[PDB]
Amino acid sequence: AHFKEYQVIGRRLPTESVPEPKLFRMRIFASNEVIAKSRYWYFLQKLHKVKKASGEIVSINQINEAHPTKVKNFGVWVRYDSRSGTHNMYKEIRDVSRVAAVETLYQDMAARHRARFRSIHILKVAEIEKTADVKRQYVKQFLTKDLKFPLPHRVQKSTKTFSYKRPSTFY
């Protein structure tokens, strides 16, 4: 969907000989809070011996972008399950928001490797601060001084089902 970003802070259940258990925090990209807390318990059950009925959610908050109108370059580390095995990938996305870069990455994985949502882990999202630290040429070709390009062959949609002159694709 159109994703949001949440921090989820959870904890075990306090008991005898373990009072005040340690708190653990995650950042989940999800479209609502129910899916956010479900993904939290998925990852915490894979990393520790805690169940959803063994622990409790302490806090759920939504994180906005600090500067939503500033074009940034993001490096994303992911791992995924193909039909044969599982692999790690690194990719680069030039966009204005982390949730926007995550949406474009999910569309790119579906288009290029036929990987669905249930078989993708976002390991890390980070911003690449300097140029000459950009590895991908498809991102590098937009970081050139005084960038200009045209848009040939403009196609315009219409109504009325009939036209009375031949169209023109000039621009």
């Binding site: 690194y90 890390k124 000459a132 630290d133 950009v134 590895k135």
Partner: protein, 150 residues
């Protein structure tokens, strides 16, 4: 068909024991590479420049945690010097600086799950060779921070 059901049982057993040996080997690799700070503060018979004073109260263990964090700064410095001008850096450089900063954030919160160094945990650590069940019986793995330990 010349397979029946006995071929299917055979291929099921072989594929299962293959997959299970793979996942078991992967879990032991994850545990060995998780329990590396323990082997670091274990090594040289608990830092054999100080193999006589068996106390390590509250500033020595902080120094040892910091040394375990910055143990790999020589490769990072060498990679900064060998990093060419018109080139993006290497994946080793990016992942090693990632390890660096993700350890330093954990240092700023609560340093490292290390030994307690306030009980017989030092004796159990010196007599704790390589098994994963020192945590199961006698760990005392209380953590500290980059300040007053708590």
């Amino acid at each position: 068909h010349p397979k029946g059901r006995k071929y299917e049982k055979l291929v099921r057993a072989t594929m299962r024991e293959d997959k299970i040996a793979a996942k078991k080997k992967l879990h032991q690799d994850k545990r060995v590479h998780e329990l590396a700070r323990v082997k670091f503060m274990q090594d040289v018979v608990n830092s054999d420049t100080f193999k006589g004073q068996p106390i390590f109260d509250h500033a020595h263990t902080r120094e040892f945690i910091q040394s375990f964090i910055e143990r790999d700064d020589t490769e990072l410095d060498e990679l900064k010097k060998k990093r060419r001008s018109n080139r993006p850096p290497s994946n080793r450089q990016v992942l090693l600086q990632q390890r660096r900063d993700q350890e330093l954030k954990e240092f700023k919160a609560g340093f490292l799950c290390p030994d307690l160094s306030d009980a017989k945990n030092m004796e159990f650590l010196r007599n704790w060779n390589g098994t994963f069940g020192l945590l199961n019986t006698l760990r005392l793995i209380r953590i500290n921070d980059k300040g007053e330990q708590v």
